[PDB]
């Protein structure tokens, strides 16, 4: 019983964090094989105007770097741009490099953040990519380069390196190809996130987890079809549901079909009336069907 946002264990990723310093800048890098990846704004010399990174790379002095894993310093062999990242070749292979892949995540998908400072992991928590390609993170100065990851069958899938905070406190990173999520710029400019819609498939997973945990006060016999729900959604900050197949086994272990939950969502979207669902007083879209399945049943 119970539902908690949790992280997958971080041990295999902790061995890959390094400290990357250049001039007055300090942030984190990811050391895989003989390469260190880090945000390219570590070689920026200003914090207000817009930076010509290609120029900053052209006048770089390789010896002004300090890259360290604990008290082990890594010598820099070369540096090339990889989108919003630097790909730094170093003179030592990380022997504790895990089996790993890169993947770019999509809105609604969950992953793990390893929040790092001074090249050392400090905290680990789960996040979910919002429709405006931001995450609900907790990062302060020095967190850039903190990685986001999932673990499947012992392979680490890296999907995020932290870059920046938007003017509201939303957090933005790049994938490991150096492509910024949501097309935000890795510049200190005025850019505003788009509006964030609640991901309806995730809200449904949360409500099925509530039913499995014995929370049923918000459920009724009232019912609404997918199509009638999708028309209300676009005027009420929620996404449309298109495939309900992922909810088949949920409806089978609880006896409650999606259409009933969709009608409950409409009532709950305003308020819970002073009541709570698994501790929440607002709908949450941070849980995927996959997370719920694992926590509810281990599969």
């Amino acid at each position: 019983a119970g539902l908690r946002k949790m992280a997958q264990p971080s041990g295999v990723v902790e061995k890959c964090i390094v400290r990357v310093c250049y001039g007055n800048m300090a942030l984190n890098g990811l050391w895989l094989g003989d390469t260190v990846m880090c945000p390219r704004h570590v070689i920026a010399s200003s914090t207000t105007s817009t930076i010509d990174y290609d120029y900053a790379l052209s006048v770089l002095r390789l010896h002004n770097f300090s890259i360290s894993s604990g008290n082990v310093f890594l010598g820099v062999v070369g540096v090339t741009m990889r989108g919003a990242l630097l790909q730094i070749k170093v003179n030592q292979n990380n022997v504790h490099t895990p089996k790993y892949t890169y993947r770019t995540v999509r809105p609604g998908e969950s992953f793990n953040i390893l929040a790092c400072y001074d090249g050392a992991a400090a905290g680990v928590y789960g996040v979910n990519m919002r429709s405006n390609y931001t995450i609900r993170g907790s990062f302060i100065n020095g967190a850039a380069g903190s990685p986001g990851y999932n673990i499947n069958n012992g392979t680490v899938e890296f999907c995020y390196l932290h870059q920046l905070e938007l003017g509201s406190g939303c957090h933005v990173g790049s994938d490991l190809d150096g492509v910024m999520y949501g097309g935000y710029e890795d510049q200190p400019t005025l850019q505003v996130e788009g509006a964030s819609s609640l991901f309806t498939e995730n809200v449904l997973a949360f409500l099925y987890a509530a039913l499995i945990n014995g929370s049923t006060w918000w459920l009724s016999s009232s019912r609404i079809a997918v199509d009638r729900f999708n028309e209300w959604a676009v005027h009420n900050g929620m996404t449309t549901v298109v495939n309900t197949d992922c909810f088949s086994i949920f409806a089978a272990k609880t006896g409650v079909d999606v259409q009933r939950l969709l009608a409950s969502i409409q009532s709950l979207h305003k308020n819970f009336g002073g009541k709570q669902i698994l501790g929440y007083t607002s709908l949450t879209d941070e849980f995927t069907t996959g997370e719920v399945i694992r926590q509810m049943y281990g599969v």
């Binding site: 920026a44 020095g142 850039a144 905070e165 935000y184 200190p188």
Partner: peptide, 5 residues
């Protein structure tokens, strides 16, 4: 206003 971290 973007803040690099």
């Amino acid at each position: 206003r973007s803040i690099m971290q």
